[PDB]
CSV table of C-alpha atoms in Angstrom, one decimal:
chain,number,residue,atom,x,y,z
A,1,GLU,CA,-74.4,169.0,21.0
A,2,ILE,CA,-74.1,165.2,20.0
A,3,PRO,CA,-71.4,165.3,17.5
A,4,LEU,CA,-72.5,163.7,14.2
A,5,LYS,CA,-70.9,163.3,11.3
A,6,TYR,CA,-74.6,162.2,9.4
A,7,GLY,CA,-76.2,164.6,10.5
A,8,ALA,CA,-77.4,168.0,8.9
A,9,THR,CA,-76.4,169.4,6.2
A,10,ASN,CA,-77.8,173.1,5.9
A,11,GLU,CA,-78.8,175.3,8.5
A,12,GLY,CA,-82.1,176.9,7.6
A,13,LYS,CA,-83.6,177.2,4.6
A,14,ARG,CA,-81.7,177.4,1.0
A,15,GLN,CA,-82.5,180.4,-0.5
A,16,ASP,CA,-80.5,179.4,-4.3
A,17,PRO,CA,-82.7,179.0,-7.4
A,18,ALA,CA,-83.1,175.9,-7.7
A,19,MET,CA,-84.5,175.3,-3.9
A,20,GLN,CA,-86.5,178.9,-4.9
A,21,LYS,CA,-88.1,177.9,-7.6
A,22,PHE,CA,-88.9,174.2,-5.7
A,23,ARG,CA,-90.5,176.2,-3.4
A,24,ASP,CA,-92.0,179.0,-5.7
A,25,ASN,CA,-93.7,176.2,-7.4
A,26,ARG,CA,-95.6,175.2,-4.3
A,27,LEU,CA,-98.5,172.8,-6.8
A,28,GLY,CA,-98.0,169.7,-7.8
A,29,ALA,CA,-98.6,166.4,-9.3
A,30,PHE,CA,-97.8,162.9,-8.1
A,31,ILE,CA,-97.8,160.1,-10.3
A,32,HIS,CA,-97.8,156.2,-8.9
A,33,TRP,CA,-97.5,153.7,-12.3
A,34,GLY,CA,-96.1,150.1,-11.7
A,35,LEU,CA,-97.6,147.0,-11.6
A,36,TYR,CA,-99.7,146.7,-8.8
A,37,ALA,CA,-101.9,149.3,-11.8
A,38,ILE,CA,-102.8,145.9,-13.4
A,39,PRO,CA,-104.6,143.5,-10.4
A,40,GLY,CA,-105.6,147.5,-9.1
A,41,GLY,CA,-106.2,145.8,-5.5
A,42,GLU,CA,-107.3,142.8,-6.9
A,43,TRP,CA,-105.4,139.1,-6.5
A,44,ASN,CA,-107.5,135.7,-7.2
A,45,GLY,CA,-111.1,137.3,-7.0
A,46,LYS,CA,-110.6,138.6,-3.4
A,47,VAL,CA,-110.5,142.6,-3.0
A,48,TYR,CA,-108.3,143.7,-1.0
A,49,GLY,CA,-109.1,147.3,1.1
A,50,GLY,CA,-105.7,148.7,1.9
A,51,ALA,CA,-103.5,150.4,-0.3
A,52,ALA,CA,-103.7,149.2,-4.5
A,53,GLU,CA,-99.4,149.7,-4.6
A,54,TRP,CA,-98.8,147.1,-1.7
A,55,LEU,CA,-101.1,144.3,-3.0
A,56,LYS,CA,-98.5,141.7,-3.5
A,57,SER,CA,-98.4,141.9,0.6
A,58,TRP,CA,-101.9,141.5,1.0
A,59,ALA,CA,-102.0,138.1,-1.0
A,60,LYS,CA,-98.9,137.1,-0.3
A,61,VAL,CA,-98.0,137.1,-3.8
A,62,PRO,CA,-93.8,135.3,-4.3
A,63,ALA,CA,-92.3,137.9,-6.3
A,64,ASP,CA,-91.9,136.0,-9.4
A,65,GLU,CA,-95.4,135.8,-9.8
A,66,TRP,CA,-95.5,139.4,-8.7
A,67,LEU,CA,-92.9,140.6,-11.4
A,68,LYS,CA,-94.7,138.6,-14.3
A,69,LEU,CA,-97.1,141.4,-14.2
A,70,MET,CA,-95.1,142.4,-16.5
A,71,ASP,CA,-96.1,140.2,-19.2
A,72,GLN,CA,-98.9,141.8,-19.2
A,73,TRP,CA,-97.8,145.8,-19.3
A,74,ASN,CA,-98.9,146.9,-22.4
A,75,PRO,CA,-100.3,150.4,-22.0
A,76,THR,CA,-101.4,151.1,-25.0
A,77,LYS,CA,-103.0,154.5,-24.4
A,78,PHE,CA,-100.0,155.3,-22.3
A,79,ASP,CA,-99.1,159.2,-24.7
A,80,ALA,CA,-96.7,161.3,-22.2
A,81,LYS,CA,-98.1,164.5,-24.0
A,82,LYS,CA,-101.5,163.8,-23.3
A,83,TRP,CA,-100.1,163.9,-19.9
A,84,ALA,CA,-98.2,166.9,-19.4
A,85,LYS,CA,-100.9,168.8,-21.3
A,86,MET,CA,-103.3,166.7,-18.2
A,87,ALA,CA,-100.6,168.3,-15.8
A,88,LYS,CA,-100.5,171.3,-16.7
A,89,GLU,CA,-104.6,172.3,-17.6
A,90,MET,CA,-104.4,171.8,-13.8
A,91,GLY,CA,-102.3,174.5,-13.0
A,92,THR,CA,-99.4,171.8,-11.4
A,93,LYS,CA,-95.7,173.2,-11.6
A,94,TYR,CA,-94.4,170.3,-11.4
A,95,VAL,CA,-94.9,166.1,-11.0
A,96,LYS,CA,-93.4,163.5,-8.8
A,97,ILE,CA,-92.7,160.3,-10.8
A,98,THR,CA,-92.6,156.5,-8.8
A,99,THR,CA,-89.5,155.5,-10.6
A,100,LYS,CA,-89.3,152.4,-8.7
A,101,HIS,CA,-92.1,151.1,-5.9
A,102,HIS,CA,-91.1,148.6,-3.5
A,103,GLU,CA,-92.4,146.1,-5.7
A,104,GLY,CA,-88.8,146.5,-7.7
A,105,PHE,CA,-91.0,147.4,-11.5
A,106,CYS,CA,-88.6,150.4,-12.5
A,107,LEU,CA,-90.3,153.0,-14.9
A,108,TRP,CA,-87.2,153.3,-16.9
A,109,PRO,CA,-85.0,150.8,-19.0
A,110,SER,CA,-82.3,150.1,-15.9
A,111,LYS,CA,-79.0,148.0,-17.1
A,112,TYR,CA,-79.0,146.5,-13.5
A,113,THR,CA,-82.1,144.7,-13.3
A,114,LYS,CA,-83.8,142.7,-16.3
A,115,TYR,CA,-87.7,143.8,-13.6
A,116,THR,CA,-87.8,146.9,-16.1
A,117,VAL,CA,-90.0,148.5,-19.1
A,118,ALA,CA,-88.1,146.8,-21.5
A,119,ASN,CA,-89.0,143.5,-21.2
A,120,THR,CA,-92.3,144.5,-21.3
A,121,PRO,CA,-94.8,144.3,-24.3
A,122,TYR,CA,-94.6,148.1,-24.2
A,123,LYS,CA,-91.1,148.2,-24.8
A,124,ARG,CA,-91.3,152.1,-24.1
A,125,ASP,CA,-89.0,154.3,-21.4
A,126,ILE,CA,-91.7,155.3,-20.1
A,127,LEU,CA,-90.6,157.5,-17.6
A,128,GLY,CA,-88.3,159.2,-20.3
A,129,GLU,CA,-91.3,160.3,-22.3
A,130,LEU,CA,-92.6,161.5,-19.4
A,131,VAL,CA,-89.7,164.1,-18.3
A,132,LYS,CA,-89.8,165.3,-22.3
A,133,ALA,CA,-93.6,166.3,-22.2
A,134,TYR,CA,-93.4,167.6,-18.7
A,135,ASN,CA,-90.4,169.2,-19.4
A,136,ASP,CA,-91.5,171.0,-23.1
A,137,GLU,CA,-94.8,171.9,-21.2
A,138,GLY,CA,-92.3,174.0,-18.8
A,139,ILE,CA,-93.5,171.8,-15.7
A,140,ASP,CA,-90.2,170.5,-13.7
A,141,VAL,CA,-90.1,166.4,-12.6
A,142,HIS,CA,-89.4,165.0,-9.5
A,143,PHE,CA,-88.1,161.2,-8.9
A,144,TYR,CA,-90.1,159.4,-6.3
A,145,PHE,CA,-87.7,155.8,-5.7
A,146,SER,CA,-88.4,153.4,-3.4
A,147,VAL,CA,-85.2,152.5,-0.8
A,148,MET,CA,-86.9,149.2,-0.3
A,149,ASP,CA,-86.8,146.3,-3.0
A,150,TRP,CA,-89.3,143.6,-2.6
A,151,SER,CA,-87.2,142.2,-6.0
A,152,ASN,CA,-84.2,141.8,-5.3
A,153,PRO,CA,-82.8,139.2,-3.3
A,154,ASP,CA,-80.0,140.9,-1.6
A,155,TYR,CA,-82.2,143.2,0.2
A,156,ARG,CA,-82.1,142.7,4.1
A,157,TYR,CA,-85.1,144.5,6.5
A,158,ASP,CA,-82.0,144.0,9.8
A,159,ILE,CA,-78.4,142.7,9.8
A,160,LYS,CA,-78.5,139.6,12.0
A,161,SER,CA,-75.6,137.9,10.4
A,162,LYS,CA,-72.3,138.1,8.5
A,163,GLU,CA,-74.8,136.8,5.5
A,164,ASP,CA,-76.7,139.8,5.8
A,165,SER,CA,-74.4,142.2,6.4
A,166,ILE,CA,-72.7,141.3,3.1
A,167,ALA,CA,-76.0,141.1,0.8
A,168,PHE,CA,-77.4,144.2,1.6
A,169,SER,CA,-73.4,146.1,0.7
A,170,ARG,CA,-74.4,144.7,-3.1
A,171,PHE,CA,-77.9,145.9,-2.3
A,172,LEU,CA,-77.1,149.3,-1.6
A,173,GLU,CA,-74.2,149.0,-4.3
A,174,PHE,CA,-77.1,148.4,-6.7
A,175,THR,CA,-78.9,151.2,-5.3
A,176,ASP,CA,-76.5,153.9,-5.9
A,177,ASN,CA,-76.2,152.5,-9.3
A,178,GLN,CA,-79.9,152.7,-10.2
A,179,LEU,CA,-79.4,156.4,-9.0
A,180,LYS,CA,-76.7,157.2,-11.0
A,181,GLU,CA,-78.1,155.7,-13.7
A,182,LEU,CA,-81.4,158.2,-13.2
A,183,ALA,CA,-79.1,161.1,-12.2
A,184,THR,CA,-77.3,161.2,-15.5
A,185,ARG,CA,-80.1,159.5,-17.8
A,186,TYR,CA,-82.2,162.4,-16.8
A,187,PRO,CA,-80.1,164.8,-16.6
A,188,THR,CA,-82.9,168.2,-16.1
A,189,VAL,CA,-84.4,166.0,-12.9
A,190,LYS,CA,-84.8,168.8,-9.5
A,191,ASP,CA,-85.7,166.5,-7.0
A,192,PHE,CA,-85.4,162.9,-5.3
A,193,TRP,CA,-88.0,161.6,-2.5
A,194,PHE,CA,-87.1,158.9,-1.0
A,195,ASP,CA,-89.4,156.2,0.2
A,196,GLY,CA,-89.2,152.5,2.1
A,197,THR,CA,-86.1,154.0,4.2
A,198,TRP,CA,-87.9,153.1,7.7
A,199,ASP,CA,-86.5,149.7,8.0
A,200,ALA,CA,-83.2,149.0,10.7
A,201,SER,CA,-81.1,147.7,8.0
A,202,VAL,CA,-81.5,151.6,7.0
A,203,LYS,CA,-81.4,152.8,10.0
A,204,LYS,CA,-78.0,151.2,10.8
A,205,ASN,CA,-76.3,152.6,7.9
A,206,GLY,CA,-76.9,156.1,8.3
A,207,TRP,CA,-73.5,157.1,6.4
A,208,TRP,CA,-75.0,155.7,3.5
A,209,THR,CA,-77.7,158.1,3.7
A,210,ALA,CA,-75.9,161.4,3.7
A,211,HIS,CA,-74.0,159.4,1.3
A,212,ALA,CA,-76.6,159.0,-1.0
A,213,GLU,CA,-77.7,162.4,-0.9
A,214,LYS,CA,-73.9,163.9,-1.0
A,215,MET,CA,-73.8,161.6,-4.1
A,216,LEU,CA,-76.5,163.2,-6.1
A,217,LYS,CA,-75.8,166.8,-4.7
A,218,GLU,CA,-72.7,166.3,-7.1
A,219,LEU,CA,-74.5,164.9,-9.8
A,220,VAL,CA,-77.3,167.4,-10.4
A,221,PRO,CA,-76.4,170.8,-10.1
A,222,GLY,CA,-79.1,172.5,-7.4
A,223,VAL,CA,-81.0,168.9,-6.4
A,224,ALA,CA,-83.6,168.8,-3.8
A,225,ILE,CA,-83.5,165.4,-1.8
A,226,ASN,CA,-86.4,165.2,0.7
A,227,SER,CA,-85.7,164.1,4.9
A,228,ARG,CA,-87.4,160.7,4.4
A,229,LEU,CA,-83.6,159.4,2.7
A,230,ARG,CA,-82.1,160.8,5.6
A,231,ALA,CA,-80.5,159.2,9.0
A,232,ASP,CA,-78.1,160.0,10.9
A,233,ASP,CA,-75.1,158.4,13.1
A,234,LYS,CA,-77.8,156.8,15.6
A,235,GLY,CA,-80.7,155.7,13.7
A,236,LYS,CA,-82.6,159.1,14.3
A,237,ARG,CA,-84.4,160.1,10.7
A,238,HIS,CA,-85.8,163.3,9.5
A,239,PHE,CA,-84.3,165.5,12.1
A,240,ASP,CA,-81.0,164.0,13.7
A,241,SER,CA,-80.2,163.6,17.4
A,242,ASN,CA,-80.0,167.2,18.2
A,243,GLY,CA,-83.2,168.0,15.7
A,244,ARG,CA,-82.2,169.6,12.6
A,245,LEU,CA,-84.2,168.6,9.8
A,246,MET,CA,-81.8,166.7,7.2
A,247,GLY,CA,-81.8,166.9,3.2
A,248,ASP,CA,-83.4,170.6,1.7
A,249,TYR,CA,-86.9,169.7,2.6
A,250,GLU,CA,-90.0,167.8,5.8
A,251,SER,CA,-91.5,165.0,4.0
A,252,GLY,CA,-94.0,164.2,6.5
A,253,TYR,CA,-97.3,165.4,6.5
A,254,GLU,CA,-98.5,162.6,4.1
A,255,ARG,CA,-102.5,162.4,4.0
A,256,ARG,CA,-102.1,164.7,7.5
A,257,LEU,CA,-101.5,169.0,7.1
A,258,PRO,CA,-99.7,171.5,10.2
A,259,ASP,CA,-102.8,172.8,12.2
A,260,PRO,CA,-102.8,175.6,11.7
A,261,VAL,CA,-102.6,177.9,14.9
A,262,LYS,CA,-100.2,175.0,16.8
A,263,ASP,CA,-97.8,174.2,14.9
A,264,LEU,CA,-96.7,177.7,13.0
A,265,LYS,CA,-93.0,175.7,13.7
A,266,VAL,CA,-92.9,174.5,9.8
A,267,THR,CA,-93.0,177.7,9.0
A,268,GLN,CA,-88.8,177.1,9.8
A,269,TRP,CA,-88.4,175.4,7.0
A,270,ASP,CA,-89.4,173.7,3.8
A,271,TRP,CA,-91.7,171.8,3.4
A,272,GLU,CA,-94.0,169.2,1.0
A,273,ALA,CA,-97.3,167.5,1.6
A,274,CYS,CA,-98.7,164.8,-0.3
A,275,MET,CA,-101.8,163.8,-0.3
A,276,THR,CA,-104.4,160.5,-1.9
A,277,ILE,CA,-107.9,161.5,-3.5
A,278,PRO,CA,-109.0,158.2,-1.2
A,279,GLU,CA,-108.0,158.0,2.0
A,280,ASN,CA,-105.5,155.6,1.6
A,281,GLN,CA,-105.0,154.3,-2.1
A,282,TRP,CA,-101.7,155.2,-4.3
A,283,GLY,CA,-101.2,153.1,-7.5
A,284,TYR,CA,-104.0,152.3,-8.8
A,285,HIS,CA,-107.3,150.7,-7.6
A,286,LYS,CA,-110.7,149.6,-9.3
A,287,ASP,CA,-113.2,150.4,-6.5
A,288,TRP,CA,-113.3,153.8,-4.9
A,289,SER,CA,-116.3,153.4,-2.7
A,290,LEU,CA,-114.1,150.9,0.0
A,291,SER,CA,-113.1,154.6,1.6
A,292,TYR,CA,-114.0,158.0,1.7
A,293,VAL,CA,-113.6,160.1,-2.2
A,294,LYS,CA,-112.1,164.2,-1.0
A,295,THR,CA,-114.1,166.0,-3.7
A,296,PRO,CA,-112.2,169.0,-5.7
A,297,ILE,CA,-112.6,171.5,-2.7
A,298,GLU,CA,-111.1,169.0,-0.4
A,299,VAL,CA,-108.3,169.2,-2.3
A,300,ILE,CA,-108.2,172.9,-3.2
A,301,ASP,CA,-108.4,173.4,0.5
A,302,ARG,CA,-106.0,171.6,1.5
A,303,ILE,CA,-103.5,172.6,-0.9
A,304,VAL,CA,-104.6,176.2,0.2
A,305,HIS,CA,-103.8,175.1,3.6
A,306,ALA,CA,-100.0,173.9,3.3
A,307,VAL,CA,-99.1,177.4,1.1
A,308,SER,CA,-100.5,179.4,4.4
A,309,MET,CA,-97.8,177.4,6.4
A,310,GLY,CA,-95.2,177.8,4.2
A,311,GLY,CA,-95.4,174.6,2.4
A,312,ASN,CA,-95.9,172.6,-1.0
A,313,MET,CA,-98.9,170.2,-1.7
A,314,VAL,CA,-98.5,167.8,-4.5
A,315,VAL,CA,-102.5,165.5,-5.3
A,316,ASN,CA,-101.7,162.1,-6.2
A,317,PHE,CA,-103.0,160.3,-9.6
A,318,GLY,CA,-102.8,156.5,-9.7
A,319,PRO,CA,-103.5,155.9,-13.7
A,320,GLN,CA,-105.2,152.6,-14.9
A,321,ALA,CA,-102.2,150.4,-16.1
A,322,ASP,CA,-103.8,151.1,-20.1
A,323,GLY,CA,-101.6,154.4,-19.4
A,324,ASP,CA,-105.1,156.8,-19.4
A,325,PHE,CA,-106.6,158.5,-15.9
A,326,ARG,CA,-110.0,157.3,-14.2
A,327,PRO,CA,-113.0,159.0,-14.4
A,328,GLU,CA,-112.3,160.6,-11.3
A,329,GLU,CA,-109.2,162.1,-11.6
A,330,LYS,CA,-109.5,163.7,-15.3
A,331,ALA,CA,-113.0,165.8,-12.8
A,332,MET,CA,-110.5,166.5,-10.0
A,333,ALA,CA,-107.6,168.0,-12.3
A,334,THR,CA,-109.8,169.9,-14.3
A,335,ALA,CA,-111.7,171.6,-11.6
A,336,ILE,CA,-108.0,172.1,-9.7
A,337,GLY,CA,-107.5,173.9,-13.2
A,338,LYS,CA,-110.3,176.1,-13.0
A,339,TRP,CA,-110.2,177.7,-9.4
A,340,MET,CA,-106.3,177.5,-10.5
A,341,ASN,CA,-107.1,179.9,-12.8
A,342,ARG,CA,-108.7,182.3,-11.1
A,343,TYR,CA,-106.6,182.0,-7.8
A,344,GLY,CA,-103.7,180.7,-8.6
A,345,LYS,CA,-102.2,184.3,-7.4
A,346,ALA,CA,-103.3,183.9,-3.7
A,347,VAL,CA,-101.3,180.0,-4.5
A,348,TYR,CA,-98.0,180.0,-6.7
A,349,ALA,CA,-95.2,181.9,-5.2
A,350,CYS,CA,-96.9,182.6,-1.7
A,351,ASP,CA,-95.9,181.7,1.8
A,352,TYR,CA,-96.5,182.5,5.2
A,353,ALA,CA,-98.2,185.3,5.7
A,354,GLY,CA,-97.5,185.6,9.7
A,355,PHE,CA,-101.9,186.3,10.7
A,356,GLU,CA,-103.6,184.7,13.6
A,357,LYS,CA,-106.0,182.2,12.0
A,358,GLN,CA,-109.1,183.1,11.3
A,359,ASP,CA,-112.0,180.7,11.4
A,360,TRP,CA,-113.8,182.0,7.2
A,361,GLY,CA,-110.3,181.0,5.7
A,362,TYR,CA,-106.1,180.6,4.8
A,363,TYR,CA,-104.0,183.7,4.8
A,364,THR,CA,-101.1,183.6,2.1
A,365,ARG,CA,-98.3,186.3,1.6
A,366,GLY,CA,-97.1,187.6,-2.1
A,367,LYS,CA,-93.2,188.8,-2.9
A,368,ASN,CA,-95.0,192.1,-2.8
A,369,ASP,CA,-96.1,191.6,0.4
A,370,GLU,CA,-99.9,191.5,-0.6
A,371,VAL,CA,-101.3,189.2,1.8
A,372,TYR,CA,-104.5,187.6,0.5
A,373,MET,CA,-107.7,186.1,2.2
A,374,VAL,CA,-108.9,183.0,0.6
A,375,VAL,CA,-112.2,181.9,2.0
A,376,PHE,CA,-113.2,178.8,2.3
A,377,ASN,CA,-116.6,179.2,4.6
A,378,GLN,CA,-118.8,182.4,4.4
A,379,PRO,CA,-119.8,184.1,7.8
A,380,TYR,CA,-123.4,184.6,8.2
A,381,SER,CA,-122.6,187.5,9.6
A,382,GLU,CA,-121.2,189.1,6.6
A,383,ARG,CA,-117.9,190.1,7.8
A,384,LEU,CA,-114.6,188.5,7.9
A,385,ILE,CA,-112.8,189.2,10.8
A,386,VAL,CA,-108.6,190.5,10.8
A,387,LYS,CA,-106.5,190.8,12.9
A,388,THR,CA,-103.8,192.8,12.5
A,389,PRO,CA,-100.6,191.9,14.1
A,390,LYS,CA,-98.1,194.9,15.9
A,391,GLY,CA,-98.0,197.9,13.8
A,392,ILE,CA,-99.3,196.5,10.7
A,393,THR,CA,-102.6,198.2,9.1
A,394,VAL,CA,-104.9,197.3,6.6
A,395,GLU,CA,-105.2,199.9,3.9
A,396,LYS,CA,-107.5,198.3,1.1
A,397,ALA,CA,-109.2,195.0,0.6
A,398,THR,CA,-110.0,193.9,-3.2
A,399,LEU,CA,-111.5,190.9,-4.2
A,400,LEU,CA,-109.3,189.3,-6.6
A,401,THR,CA,-111.4,188.2,-10.0
A,402,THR,CA,-113.4,191.2,-10.7
A,403,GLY,CA,-111.0,193.9,-9.1
A,404,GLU,CA,-113.9,195.6,-7.1
A,405,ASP,CA,-113.2,197.8,-4.1
A,406,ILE,CA,-114.0,195.5,-0.6
A,407,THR,CA,-114.9,197.6,2.9
A,408,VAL,CA,-113.0,197.7,5.4
A,409,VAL,CA,-114.5,198.8,9.0
A,410,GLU,CA,-111.9,199.0,12.3
A,411,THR,CA,-114.0,197.3,14.8
A,412,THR,CA,-110.8,197.5,17.7
A,413,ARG,CA,-108.0,198.5,18.2
A,414,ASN,CA,-106.2,196.1,15.6
A,415,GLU,CA,-109.2,194.1,14.8
A,416,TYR,CA,-111.3,195.0,10.8
A,417,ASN,CA,-114.6,193.6,9.7
A,418,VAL,CA,-113.7,192.9,6.1
A,419,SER,CA,-116.8,192.8,4.2
A,420,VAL,CA,-118.1,189.4,1.7
A,421,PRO,CA,-118.7,190.1,-2.0
A,422,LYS,CA,-121.7,191.8,-2.4
A,423,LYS,CA,-122.3,189.2,-4.6
A,424,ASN,CA,-121.8,185.3,-2.9
A,425,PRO,CA,-118.8,183.7,-5.0
A,426,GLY,CA,-119.9,180.5,-4.5
A,427,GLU,CA,-117.3,179.0,-4.6
A,428,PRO,CA,-113.7,179.2,-2.3
A,429,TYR,CA,-112.9,183.5,-3.0
A,430,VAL,CA,-110.4,185.2,-2.9
A,431,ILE,CA,-110.0,189.2,-1.3
A,432,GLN,CA,-106.5,190.4,-1.9
A,433,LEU,CA,-105.3,193.1,0.8
A,434,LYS,CA,-103.4,196.2,1.0
A,435,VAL,CA,-100.5,196.3,4.1
A,436,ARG,CA,-98.8,199.1,5.7
A,437,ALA,CA,-96.2,198.6,8.3
A,438,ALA,CA,-95.6,201.5,11.2
């Protein structure tokens, strides 16, 4: 054991009701919305291929000039009730919102900086309106927060002088102030998802990361805190120097998912993946031809994949500067919602099933021993192979949508062919198994 003051605080998964809710939700949406939506990846006639929310960096824009985009912040089509309805129809159980991204513009009227929604033509507390509207639909709200802040000259990337130390200490105070403000202004918040914590300055101040977790947990009963916030005494991030997960869940499979065969270790902790629709755009980018754009079925595959390995999945949206969503995003949310309405019993409140991975798709397990086969790849053989763990048998198979009985044939000791449905469902589909343990 390496002695640590600022390492892991949880042993194993939290099982209090608030964490069970975070987990059972399973499917979320992400909102990246800030000043970067205005230029939408273009600056002075050049369209940059990099992530739109990083345009200040790509185009080397000074802070004062970038922040002058506030003069153009007037999203007249914004309607928090419409956003919440969109999320509800998609089947999301929670929404994670960029309270402040690296640019430092705040979606709530912070008293600790002038770079906020209050000092724009629109004036209104976007974050507060969203919290109310999502909550009215029974949707939990999580707050994204970037520690790295390009708008505050006290930020430092590393500490190389006494003046750096003093400035960064002021920065950490400012950060604390904003975090306490979020936690008290929006007391229904269920999670803080930290970003921009990779710099040497933060790594050298692991004590602060532990303090932030503790401070927020005191202010917001049951709140979840992501692993990305956390560094230990030695500067090790996410997992401490003894290999123990810090925070309440692992946040890391950002546009990447664990391997269904080789990465079963992830089933031992709570975790949440977050994904973009294009390859690498989070904020609004005006030109989605520049990289591969995922289809709804590709997104649904990723959602089920995460749940099959005991994790949550969050699908990102980058709203337009005007406060509406682009057509591709409206189509995506609607297609996901249609599928979730039909097949969501295999997603919501489901978890890892403990079965060997098969080529047809994924298993998920419900709260009362239901085992769902979620079929993405239809065998020409018309047989879905099911290999059961020792002592487990398959008593029945049923097509989820219709309740029709599906033939199950024992082929070997411990292996069955489950027939495909008589009629090809023509989309990824669910067969529910009844299983028995010896």
